[PDB]
Design a protein around this nucleic acid. Structure first.
Ligand SMILES: [Mg+2]
Ligand SMILES: [Mg+2]
Ligand code: NA
Length: 326
DNA sequence: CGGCATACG
DNA sequence: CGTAT
DNA sequence: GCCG
C-alpha cells in the first residue's frame, strides 16, 4: 500500500505523526553530523513515510510492512509510543556534540566538515568563533555577523515584499523576465529560513548574463548585505517596523527550455528531489537534474513544457507542490 | 553486498 | 571547501 | 539503516 519512494506518494505539509517524524529526523541529523549519509537517508525516509500516513500510528503493529522501518527505526517508535520519549533521541539532544554541530552548521558558510574540525579544536560557541576571526572566510564572517537575524523565521508577508523588489530589479535588468517563488514557500510553508526565487525569460537565450545585471541593481538599491553565474546566495536587507532585518534569499536563473526542471528541482523538498532522482535513475533508467532529463540509451534529453510533463515522462502520478513535503 | 541525487559558487 | 532543492 |  505504501510505496517505497517518497515521490510515489503525497506528503502534505502537516500530518498525523509529527512527534514520531521529528524524533527520527533528530537521529537523521545526528547521523549526518557523523558523516553517515546512509543512516541519515534511512532515518529521513522513515520519517517521511510517517508524514504520508493518513492517521496517527498508535501501535507497533501498524509499522509492519512499512518501507524503511527495520529494527532501529521501529524501536524508536516503540519507545515513543510506550513512554513518550526515546532514550537514544534524548541522549543525542542533550549531547555536547550534537548541540555544537547544530549550532555551527547553522552558520551560513559552515558545513559539517568545518564544524567538525572546529569541534575537535575545542570550539563550542559563536563567541569562540568571533574571538578568532582570522580563521573565518568572508562568507563565514557574514553568516556569523547576521546569525541572529538569520535564525528568525521569514514570514509569508515578508516574501511578497521581497518578491516585488526583486521583480523591479529584474524588470530593469531584462524587460519581460519573470520571477517565480520556489522552495518551501511554494510548497505552502507559512514560515521559512530563506526565500528562493527562479528567474527566466520567455525568449530562449535572453536570460544569458542576467544574474550579474540583477545583482548589480539590487546592490545599487542598497538591498544586498552580502553576496559573492546562475545561482546567487545573498543576504538581503528586509524592511521591518522602524528598522530592518537580514534575510537569506537565493536567486536562480534558468533558460525557459529548462524552467520546468529548475522549478521542480528548486521547489523540493530536498528529500523529495533526491528520491525523485533515485527513482528516475534506478527504476526508469533516466538521469534527472535541475536542467533536464536524459535518456542515456538514446542519448537524448526530454523536452518538458511543465512539471506535469516531467511526472508523466517518469510514469508517476502528478503531485502538486503542497504534496511534495517529503 | 552495493547503493544511497545532483548540481553550481 | 561552501551553497541549493 | 535499510532495500533489492
Ligand atoms: Mg528555501
Ligand atoms: Mg534557499
Ligand atoms: Na551552514
Amino acid at each position: 500500500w505504501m510505496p517505497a519512494y517518497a515521490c510515489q506518494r503525497p506528503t502534505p505539509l502537516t500530518h498525523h505523526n509529527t512527534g514520531l517524524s521529528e524524533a527520527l529526523e533528530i537521529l537523521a541529523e545526528a547521523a549526518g553530523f557523523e558523516g553517515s549519509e546512509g543512516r541519515l537517508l534511512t532515518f529521513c525516509r522513515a520519517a517521511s513515510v510517517l508524514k504520508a500516513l493518513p492517521s496517527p500510528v498508535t501501535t507497533l503493529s501498524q509499522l509492519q510492512g512499512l518501507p524503511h522501518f527495520g529494527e532501529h527505526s521501529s524501536r524508536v517508535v516503540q519507545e515513543l509510543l510506550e513512554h513518550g520519549v526515546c532514550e537514544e533521541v534524548e541522549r543525542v539532544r542533550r549531547s555536547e556534540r550534537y548541540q555544537t554541530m547544530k549550532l555551527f552548521t547553522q552558520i551560513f558558510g559552515v558545513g559539517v566538515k568545518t564544524a567538525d574540525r572546529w569541534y575537535r579544536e575545542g570550539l563550542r560557541t559563536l563567541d569562540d568563533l568571533r574571538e578568532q576571526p582570522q580563521k573565518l572566510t568572508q562568507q563565514q564572517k557574514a553568516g556569523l555577523q547576521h546569525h541572529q537575524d538569520l535564525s528568525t523565521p521569514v514570514l509569508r508577508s515578508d516574501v511578497d515584499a521581497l518578491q516585488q523588489v526583486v521583480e523591479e530589479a529584474v524588470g530593469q535588468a531584462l524587460p519581460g523576465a519573470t520571477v517565480t517563488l520556489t522552495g518551501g514557500f511554494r510548497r505552502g510553508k507559512l514560515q521559512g529560513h530563506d526565500v528562493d526565487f527562479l528567474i527566466t525569460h520567455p525568449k530562449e537565450g535572453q536570460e544569458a548574463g542576467l544574474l550579474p545585471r540583477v545583482m548589480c541593481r539590487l546592490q545599487d538599491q542598497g538591498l544586498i548585505l552580502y553576496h559573492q553565474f546562475e545561482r546567487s546566495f545573498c543576504i538581503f536587507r528586509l524592511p521591518q517596523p522602524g528598522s530592518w532585518k537580514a534575510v537569506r534569499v537565493d536567486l536562480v536563473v534558468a533558460p525557459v527550455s529548462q524552467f520546468p526542471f529548475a522549478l521542480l528541482g528548486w521547489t523540493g523538498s530536498k528529500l523529495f528531489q533526491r528520491e525523485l532522482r533515485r527513482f528516475s535513475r534506478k527504476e526508469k533508467g533516466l538521469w534527472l537534474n535541475s536542467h533536464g532529463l536524459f535518456d542515456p540509451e538514446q542519448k537524448t534529453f526530454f523536452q518538458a513544457a511543465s512539471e506535469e510533463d516531467i511526472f508523466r515522462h517518469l510514469g508517476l502520478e502528478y503531485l502538486p507542490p503542497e504534496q511534495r513535503n517529503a
